[PDB]
Each structure stands twice: as C-alpha cells, then as structure tokens.
Enzyme design. Sequence first.
Site: not given
Ligand SMILES: Cc1cc2nc3c(=O)[nH]c(=O)nc-3n(C[C@H](O)[C@H](O)[C@H](O)COP(=O)(O)O)c2cc1C
Lengths: 349, 349, 349, 349
Positions: D128, D153, D224, D248
């Site tokens: 990030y 991302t 991403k 996301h």
């Molecule tokens: C609690 C939580 C924290 C997340 N933190 C990050 C992060 O720090 N960096 C990032 O690129 N994506 C982050 N994501 C997004 C995930 O990489 C991913 O795209 C997403 O959860 C995929 O969907 P799903 O939860 O239905 O599998 C986060 C998602 C959740 C639910």
Amino acid sequence: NLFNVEDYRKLAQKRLPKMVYDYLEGGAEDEYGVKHNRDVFQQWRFKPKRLVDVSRRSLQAEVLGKRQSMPLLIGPTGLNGALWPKGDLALARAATKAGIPFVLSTASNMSIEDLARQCDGDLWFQLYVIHREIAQGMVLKALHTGYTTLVLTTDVAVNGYRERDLHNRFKIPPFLTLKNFEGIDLGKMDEMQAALMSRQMDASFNWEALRWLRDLWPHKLLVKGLLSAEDADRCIAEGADGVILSNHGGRQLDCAISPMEVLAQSVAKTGKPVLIDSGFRRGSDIVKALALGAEAVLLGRATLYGLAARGETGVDEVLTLLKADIDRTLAQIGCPDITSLSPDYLQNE
Amino acid sequence: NLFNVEDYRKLAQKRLPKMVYDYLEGGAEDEYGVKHNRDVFQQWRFKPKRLVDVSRRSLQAEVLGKRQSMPLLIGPTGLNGALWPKGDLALARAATKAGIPFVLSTASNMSIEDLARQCDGDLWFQLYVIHREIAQGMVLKALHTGYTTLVLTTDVAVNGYRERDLHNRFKIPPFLTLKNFEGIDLGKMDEMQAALMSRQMDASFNWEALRWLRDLWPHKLLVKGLLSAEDADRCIAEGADGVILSNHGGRQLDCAISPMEVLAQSVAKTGKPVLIDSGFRRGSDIVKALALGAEAVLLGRATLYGLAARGETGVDEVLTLLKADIDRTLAQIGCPDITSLSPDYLQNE
Amino acid sequence: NLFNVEDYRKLAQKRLPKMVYDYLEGGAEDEYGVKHNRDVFQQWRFKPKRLVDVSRRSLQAEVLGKRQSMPLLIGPTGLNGALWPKGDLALARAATKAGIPFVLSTASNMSIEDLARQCDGDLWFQLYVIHREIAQGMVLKALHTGYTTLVLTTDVAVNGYRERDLHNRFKIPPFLTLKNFEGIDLGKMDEMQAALMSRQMDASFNWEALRWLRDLWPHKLLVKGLLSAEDADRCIAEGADGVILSNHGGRQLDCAISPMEVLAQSVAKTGKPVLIDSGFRRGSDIVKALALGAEAVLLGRATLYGLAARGETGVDEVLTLLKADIDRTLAQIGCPDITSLSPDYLQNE
Amino acid sequence: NLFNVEDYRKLAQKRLPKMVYDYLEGGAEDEYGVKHNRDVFQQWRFKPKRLVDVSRRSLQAEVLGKRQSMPLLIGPTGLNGALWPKGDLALARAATKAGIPFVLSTASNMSIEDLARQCDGDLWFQLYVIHREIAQGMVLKALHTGYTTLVLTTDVAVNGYRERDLHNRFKIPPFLTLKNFEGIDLGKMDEMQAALMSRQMDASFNWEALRWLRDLWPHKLLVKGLLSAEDADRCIAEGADGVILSNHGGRQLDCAISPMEVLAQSVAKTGKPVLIDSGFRRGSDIVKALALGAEAVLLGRATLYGLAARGETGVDEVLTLLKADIDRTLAQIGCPDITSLSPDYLQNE
Ligand SMILES: Cc1cc2nc3c(=O)[nH]c(=O)nc-3n(C[C@H](O)[C@H](O)[C@H](O)COP(=O)(O)O)c2cc1C
Ligand SMILES: Cc1cc2nc3c(=O)[nH]c(=O)nc-3n(C[C@H](O)[C@H](O)[C@H](O)COP(=O)(O)O)c2cc1C
Ligand SMILES: Cc1cc2nc3c(=O)[nH]c(=O)nc-3n(C[C@H](O)[C@H](O)[C@H](O)COP(=O)(O)O)c2cc1C
Ligand SMILES: Cc1cc2nc3c(=O)[nH]c(=O)nc-3n(C[C@H](O)[C@H](O)[C@H](O)COP(=O)(O)O)c2cc1C
C-alpha cells in the site's frame, strides 16, 4: 390429504426417522441443485390447442421399442429397504401393476435373482462398477434371470458431498445389507479385489470400458448420468441403445445443470431414445419433458415418498395420481395421444 | 377501507365461510398460474405523453361494434348464488347500471329466461356443452329471450385439479341448483342422455362441432378459453365474430401461459375483436391490455369480491372504483380517449 | 447513528406523526413504483479506472450554464411546513450553504416573495397551473423577486391515487396554508375563477399553453415530469431550456417507468440539459445518473428526511453526507472531475 | 460440524467479539456488493464430461511459472492479529504446509523480516503506498528478506464507507500495531512525511508511479484491485507480470462489478496470468474461475474464518476441506488434471 406427490413427501417426513428422511431428501452441498432441478420446469408454460376431441386419450407408449402403459419408470435407488421393509419388492410390484418397468439398483437390499423370482414385470438392472470382475458377475446374473435392459450409471465416480448426512453422521442402518455383493470369494491370490469393498467406485471406468460392457450385454443398453448432447451422442456411437440424462437428483454435484437444459439438443443430435430424470414431481414436469422429446421419465424420490409413507400401496397410489395427472394434462392441452406431444405445446418463459 | 379490488377481496374473505372462499380464490395445483396471471402485468410499464389536454376524457367504446360505457364486462362465473343470494341478478343489475354487458353462466343459479325477465341490460350467454341436444335447447332459449351474444367456453374439457377443494371436500352448497338443467325429460328411449348428468363436459367438442354451433346461433359468437393466436385465427376462420383469450383465471391448468402473452399476436393475426380475462385487478392491468389491442377485458373474481362482500351494492362499488381507476390512468398517461390507446404508451420490461 | 439517508428516514419516521410520515413516504396504489425507482439503479454497476491520480477531486459543475458546488438541487416539494416549522426556509438555507439551488413549490407554506426576502441563494420556482391568470401572477411575482429559473411540472393533471392517505383520511394539517394563493380577489364578474379553488389542476395545459408560458418567462425554463425522449425533445423544440425527467417520486402513476430508463436516450436526442429525480438515495445512484449524461439530480424525499428529523441542521447534514458520498465514489471509480463522468464507468447488469 | 467454509464462519462469529466480527464480515454501504460477489457464481453451472478416467487427479499448477500444490493462495489481509494471536504467522504456516503462497499485508501485525525469519514458505508482499519513500523502504526490505513476488493493491485510494464499523465506532484494538511502519525517523527537515501517518493512502499513485515501482522491484510484479480488461492490459503494458482482478471483497465500492464479470475478457486480452479474488467460498466457485482462465484464486475471508475460529489449525482445516472440495469437483466434472479446465465445462445461466 394425499392428493399429489408433495402430500406423500410430507407424510413420509412424518414417518421416517429424521436421519433417514435427510438421507433421502438431501442433496449435495448448498442444495442449490435440487432447487434448480425444480425451478427449471418454470422455464416452460403451456399453449393448449382448443377444440380438439380429447374424449379418448392414450398414455400408452413405446420405450426402447417396447410398449408400456405410460412413459414412466421407477428408477434405480439403493437401500430401499431403509425406507420400507422389502422396499425393492414393493416398488417393483407397484410398477408392474401400473404396467411400467422397475430398475433394480446395484445397491439394492434384495438380490438380482430374488426379485426376478418374485416379480414378473419388466425388470431393468442398474450397474455401478466397483470391481470389473464383480460387475461382470452381476451383469451375467441379471442376464440369466431375465432382466430386459442394462443401465450403467456413470455419475458417481466419487461420492457426493451431502452435508445433511455429514451432520447426522449417517450410518447405513444395521439391517440393510448390500445383497448383490453377498457371498463372494476369499482366495489368497486366485483374489484381493476384496480390497475393493470400500465406499468408492471405479473412477477409471471410461469409453473403452463401456465397449467392454457393450460386448458383454446382448440386450438394450442405456448410459445414465449424462449432462450433454455430446456425451449422449458419444454413448450412441459406442453402442448404447439410448441414454438417461440425469444429475442424480441433485445429490452429486450441486452446481450441475439440470438435464432439462440439454434435453432438446440431445434428442436432435443422437436420434436415439433420450430418457431423463431429476426434479420430476408434477405431471406437468413430465409432459414438458416428453413434449421436448424425452422417450420417458424416471421417477426417483416421487415414488420413494409413496414407499416411505405407505409401502407398496403408497407406491401404487403415487403412480395412479401421476397417471391421472398426466392424463388430465393431456386433455387440458389438447394432445389426446401422448405420443403426439411436441415443442408446439410449450412457450419458453 | 374499501378503496380498491384487494380491499374487497379482504372483506369477502371475512364474510365467506372458508370453504366457499377457497373455492372462489383457489387455482389449479400449485397456484403458480394465478400468481403468474398477476405477475405478467409487471412486464409492461407506462411511458405517459405529457402536455396533452386531458380535461375531457372518454371511456366509451364499441365492443363487437356496439357502444358501451367502458370496455369492461362482468364475465361468466357459475354458482354465483353461493357467494350472495340471487348473485346472478345482483351482478347483472350492477353491470346494467354501469352500462356494460353481463355474461350468464351455463351453471348459473338463476335461469336464462328468469334473468332476462328481471334485467334489461345487455345480456350475454356462456355455453358449456355437456350434451349436444341439451346445449341446443339452452342456446335457443337464450336466443328467444333476447340474449345478444353467445360465448362458447372451451377450456373445461375436463375439470381442473384444484387442491383447495379436494382438501376441503368441497360439496356444492345445498341450496344451489343448476337452474338451466331444470325440468328435463325422462323418456326411456325417446332418452338416457340423463347419463350425461355428471361433473364432466363433452370432451369431444371440436372444430366441426363449432360449425354446428355457428349455424345454430344467428348473432355475435365468441369462443372463450383460447391461448394462441393460431387457435384464435382458426376460430375466426370457422365463423366466430371474436374470441376471448383466457386461462380461466388459473383454475384449469396451473402451467398455462397468461393470455397476455399472446394478446398482441392474436390482435395482429385475426384482425377481429380479441377480448381477454385472467388476472385483472387494477385499472392499470386493464389499460395495459387495451393498449396492446384488446377489445375489452372481462372481470372474473374482481367483481365477485364485491358481490361476496356487499352484494349488488358491492358490485356497483367495485365497478365505480375500476371506472375511476381507468379514467385516472388515462389522464395520467395522456390518452384522453380510451379508443386511442396503443402500444406506444407502454415500455416492455 | 446518522451515516446515510436511510438513517435519516428512520429518525424521521420516529419524529413525525404516522399520518404525516405516510403522506411523505407513500406512493401511488401498490407502491410498485417507488420500489422500482430504487431497484432500477441495480441495473448498473461500476467498472472503476485504477491508477488514476484522484488526490485532487472536483464536484463543481455547471447546470444550465451556471456553476454550482455539485450537480445536486433540492427539488420542489409542497407543504414542507408540515414536516418542520418554516420548512421551506430551512431547506433553502441548507441548499444555499451547500452552494446549490432550491426549488420553491407552488404549494409552499412560505410565499414566493418572503423566501426571496429571507434567502440569497439561487432560487428556482416550480409552477403548477390551476388557473392561467393566477399562474401568470405567480410567474411575474417570481420574476420580479429574482427567481432565476422557472420549472413547469406537468405530471399532476389529476391527483395520484395514494392509498395510505385514503386509509388515514389524511387532512392537510390545520396551520399549513397555501401562501402563494393568499389574498386573491373576489369580484362578481370582473371573476369566479374562485371556482378554481379545488384540489385539481388545469388538465388542459398542453403544448400551445407551454408556448404561452415560454413567452411569459424570460429566463431559463424547464419542464418537469417527462418520461420519454420524444416528450423531452418536443419540450426543447417548443422553447424549453432543458427538462427534468421524473415520475414524481412514484406518487402519481404506480406503473410509470423510472426516468432512468429514458435518461441516455433523452440526453442523446435533445442535446440539451437533462436533469432527473425519482428514487435517488445513495451517492452511487447519483453518479450513475450523471455518468449516463444527466446534468443534475434533484433530491425529493432524501433531504425531506433530514428536514423532518432535525430541521435545517438535518438538511445540512444530509447534504454533507451526500456530497462526501459523491466525492468518495468519484475517487473510487477513478473520475476525479465530476464533469468527466461517462457511460464508460458503468456496466449494464 | 465443521464441513465447509460457512461452518467456520459460524464458529468464528461465536468466538469473535461482535465489533471484530462485523469489521471482518462487513462490506461497503448496503452490502449489495458482497451479496453480488456470492450471487454471480450462480451465473454458471457445470456440464460434466462422463466416462473419463478420473482415478488419478492432479491439482498441481504453475502460478507465474512456479509450481504449487493447488491454484490457491492466502491473500493479503491486514490486522490479522486482531483475529487470532500472531495471526499472520498462523496463516503463513498453514499456507506453507498446504504448499501455497501467503501474501503479507502492508498493515500486518508481524513485520516483513520477522515472518521471513519464522516461515520458509513462498512469501509474497502486498504493498500500500502512503508515502513513496516509506514504500521504497518496505519494498527493499521485502526484497532483501527473500519475498518472491510484489503485489500492489490499488483499490484503496480512499477508505471504503463501511457502516457496520461506523455504527460500532470500531477502534482498531489496542494491542494491534502496524509493525511495518515501526521505528521510522523524526528529523526536522532531513522529514515531516510524518504528516503521512493518517488513515489515508497516496491517492495520486498512477501509471507513472507504477513504472517507478516496476523499476524498483526485480521479481514478479502483480497489480491488485483491477476491474476491467483494459486496466489489466495497461498494467501488462507498463511492465506488470500479471494482475489480480478484485473488488476487495466488497469492502470498497458497494456497486463495483464482481471481478468474475471481466475474467474471461481479461484473460483473452492480456495473454498474461490473471489471478482473482472476491466472493470465493465453495470449491465450485474456484473451479468456475479457473475454468474461465484464472491462473489462481486468492482467499480472503474464507481462511480468516478458520483463523478466527481455531487459529493455525483452523486455517489448515479450511485449506484441506477446500482442497478436497476442489479435487472432488474435478472428479465429478471429469477433468482429472486441474490445468485442463476450460469454459467447456460450464453452462452460462
Ligand atoms: C478483514 C479484511 C482485511 C483486508 N486487508 C487487506 C490488506 O491489508 N491489503 C489488501 O490488498 N487487501 C486486503 N483485503 C482484501 C483481500 O485481499 C481480498 O481482496 C478480499 O478479502 C477477497 O474477498 P473475500 O473476502 O470474499 O475472499 C482485506 C479483506 C478483509 C475481509
Ligand atoms: C435415496 C436415493 C438413492 C439412489 N440410489 C441410486 C442407485 O443406487 N443407482 C443410481 O443409478 N441412481 C440412484 N439414485 C438416483 C436416481 O436414479 C435418480 O437419478 C434421481 O433420484 C432422480 O431425481 P429425483 O429424485 O428428483 O427424481 C438415488 C436417489 C435417491 C434420492
Ligand atoms: C368461482 C368462479 C366460477 C367460474 N365459473 C365459470 C363458468 O361457469 N363459465 C366460464 O366460462 N368461466 C367461468 N369462470 C372463469 C371466468 O369466466 C374468468 O375466465 C376468470 O375468472 C377470469 O380470471 P380472474 O378471476 O382473475 O378475473 C369462473 C371463475 C371463478 C373464479
Ligand atoms: C411530500 C412530497 C411533496 C411534493 N411536492 C411537490 C410539488 O409541490 N411540486 C412538484 O413539482 N413536485 C413535488 N414533489 C415531487 C418532487 O419534486 C420529486 O419529483 C420527487 O420527490 C422525487 O423523488 P424522490 O422522492 O424519490 O426523490 C413532491 C414529493 C414528495 C415526496
């Protein structure tokens, strides 16, 4: 209040222990499959033909060239004894009284030869291949005892992930034994195919293996579990006399298409009998499939609800309601002769 | 709180015994049909024309060439006496006061000649053929007593499988008698058509039979129960002066298409008046059908709710709300003259 | 917990007497219209453009050629005083602080000249024509007091059938008086247009009448209540400077299409500003409309929820959330400048 | 009863305080996005190929040219320590035991170098950019400690409006500290980038900035957060080795399309690896994506449910069920080798 299949399901749910009921009604994973199996029928509606003389109607029809009372069959379901004592006989006798074939499962509670000894209707045998040699034995048994047609079900290469059973730790009831595997060898080399007493089938059975089976069986051969016109056509090319489009009543792959989605295509491509099952509950569902070209429809759970709720009599009852249901539908859409059904009576929705 | 048809249904449900209410509101099998009859109207929305002078509006219209107050009719429903005393008269009088025709059912509780004797509005007669000779008698009766138009309903070759009635063991209330079949013979040869006192109609009535009926009746002839432009067109070819697209309000075949699905096509193909019923509750449903080319809309349950809830006055009330509903809709979409309606005011959704 | 418009609706429902709340939230007949107004927005989804510098964003935009803080307006709603004391002023002041226009209703509780005297923002006047001469007076009043643009709403030729009001016998609260009709004549011939103090408007106002209005008003003229590109185009041909596609927030015709259904078409055909209202609650709804070409979106109930719940402050609050909502959406889809929005950011679903 | 991902979600909901559970399960605004993420998978169904030898199956596959046990990855999620002590390590160890990569978040609770020191699996780093110079430091740290691939991302230019958190006044738990930002300067000029300790990222990061990042990192680089084939293609043109289609997990833009909607197109246009996440819960969802051309699927919440409910063991458990789920699905559709998946096994619904 026993006026349709759903009424029998309700009564069956009341009489069966929950674990057995769940094992019967259950589907794979989220059960979006069984739901879809039911919902797909709403994709067609009727456009009846009025002012047609329907004072004399006929449900008689040939299936694989052989006349029967109506284009219905009681399909192969295993462990019927768990639903009602001597379930296999009850089903076969109800089908015989109704004038339609009954298909014995490889996993039946009554043996191939015992049923034939006690029922004179048209008996079909459904084969699951776990061990080739064992399969050959059952096929020859069925042949020698007068079973008219062989049905190879191919959609259980592996077991379906049915979560109701997993949550109930479903253990095949005590009494129920797989009769057809009874009394089989125990040599020490001449063999340990005994190792093949697992809950898994031969995941290698393929087209070449089908040829083997084709040469082994002399009568009508059907391949069950197909979900594409391409597979149905290949089956015909390899010698099958027809096919049974099916997703095993939603119990194997939750996201499988409904066989109704490839029915018209399979009929047009193969040019051979295309039977079907999965989701049929109302006579209307049945007429829609026949109208699209299906040779016949196999009943799975519908007749099992009758069995579970009231034994043989219950099965007789479900079949008479379904017959009267079909007959009434033919009158209403103006197609007195069931063999005259065509896509013309339907409207795609 | 009686501001629309649904309000009258609610009040009717409160006043009718459950068994009678179920017999009225009920549909065939799963009742997916009645539901579809209602849902299909959502397939169209309005595209009003703004800045049109709608200070002077007209709902007047010709139906089969004869002017009436609005393109509505109280359609044929049997056993109206079971909903309210002298139901048939109440309905006919409300229709007459409203300036629209009333259609007497073959299964009415008031005789053909008694109604004509007590009501001077435009009376139509709906014919069910159970026995040809008996049918001929009723038709001539209607002719001789001044009924203006004959309506042959063809969608009851066999009775609909209505499960609410089956669960309630619905027995046609005591008092209610089929007046039109009253006092009819009993010879011993010159005949036992007496055998034709069953709950089933002549399932053989066909196109040839329609010609017979056509030669028998001299005035306007309509064929009711059609669900295809092809059937509607054949009816016209055989001499009918128009047709009534209909699925009998979802009470005959649960999976029948809604007549709204073949309305535009029937209008374009036949070139003759195409009336319609089945599912109409809001003025908007009515305007949508008229816009698609329907000559008129027949009310079934809508006016029966008024009858069941408050007798004649209730029917008058339902018709004034519907009239005001239609009128208001015309103003809102900018079509002051109801005869100017066209597909132009609609948006397919 | 006041984080979005819905939160304000909830609080407004708690503070308003039920009858007033129903009068505000209610729609015509079955309310399938208001529901559709909301549902239609789900027909589009976002396809954001990544790696775009959105560190500096702009919601500034010209509406009818005049720059404002964001392409939003508080649209005309009558009887605002029934929602909060001096509701009209509260709304106008919140809009002014936010940098967007406020549209005064002909049925406002504060007079045309009193609002202008107490608020220096961009004031628009919405005209309902009940009596031509009376309309001319209000229009000249608005002109002389500095109202910048005139809005003719044409979708109330007749009153909408809102059943919530009928069930509640909704009687316009005591205090609320139609200020703009205050102190008007009473001659005995030189006239009884006094007869025109009814609840109905001039249903004859048509295209010719629009020309009359066009010659009367010298500034920007908009026609509100349109639901077709054809009507929008005719309005432009007759002299209008733009239009407001609208179905009056579902309160007039339950089956009217949503203006969103003819937005793109109206923009392409007229080539003039196309504003829109009806169903807007989330910033996403607003961005979708702007992306399709709308010049601006008028808020109806959204800001009224803020008014009803917390007066002026509530309106300020709803507008800051909506502004921050819009801004955040622009960043997320990668369109830093609101004037750069295009259909490119959308996916038809 | 822990037989699928949903079972783990249920157990996780029981063990996590409500505020933490809401922070994990929650989505942006109305949560129509997360719902759509799940619903979109029903747009495809399976057309299995029967009579295929599936006795020997393989889930092995190359991702970015490197073989792994199955085409799955535990994707980047921040604040894992809030779900279970040393959550980051637990996840990384479960992934390593399963033979798949683990992606460390910039907002992890364990530092880049500490994880590498304690886990020998394939470690990826998700970046990030808040402050360019700070970003450069982390990237070089990751490079020097052996992280194999870099993931940028790009869908958090601004924070998502998650109303569950707003209602719960969600305050990042006490213990949890952003380890990767630990111990960083404090000069007085040689700088106040300290000002960049906000909750907002660099909203200016654009294509030019991506080139900068591309020259900085020598290994495989993925972008991403993409939701269009056009953006995916531009990323490849600018030097990226592949992309991760993603919304996301519905937490950023409620109305964003599901990445599944542009999967096939991105695969055909870029000609490079297209990974994807967002909405994956069942093995069937995963197989559908692989069949459409996805190189691999990243798990977000699925494995977090395992972590939250039973720590490391829970993650191991979720991955073995998912693996067995995928394997079983391959057998059932007749595609023994996962790398042979193609659109041929699907039916668009
Ligand atoms: C609690 C939580 C924290 C997340 N933190 C990050 C992060 O720090 N960096 C990032 O690129 N994506 C982050 N994501 C997004 C995930 O990489 C991913 O795209 C997403 O959860 C995929 O969907 P799903 O939860 O239905 O599998 C986060 C998602 C959740 C639910
Ligand atoms: C309890 C139960 C047992 C079954 N056993 C077998 C079997 O042994 N062999 C087979 O080929 N199909 C078997 N089937 C599948 C049926 O042949 C049939 O495809 C399916 O039930 C049709 O769907 P329906 O249940 O909706 O009618 C079984 C189905 C159920 C519900
Ligand atoms: C209680 C009841 C009795 C009916 N009786 C007759 C009848 O005797 N003859 C006939 O042609 N149609 C009959 N119909 C059908 C109506 O003519 C009409 O097609 C139908 O009700 C229209 O649908 P709707 O009920 O939604 O308006 C009957 C319908 C109902 C609900
Ligand atoms: C309580 C209420 C009063 C209204 N009064 C007027 C009015 O006096 N003049 C007018 O042109 N529109 C009027 N409208 C319609 C609005 O201008 C606007 O078209 C509509 O509310 C937009 O839809 P929405 O409520 O979903 O935003 C009114 C709407 C409501 C809900």
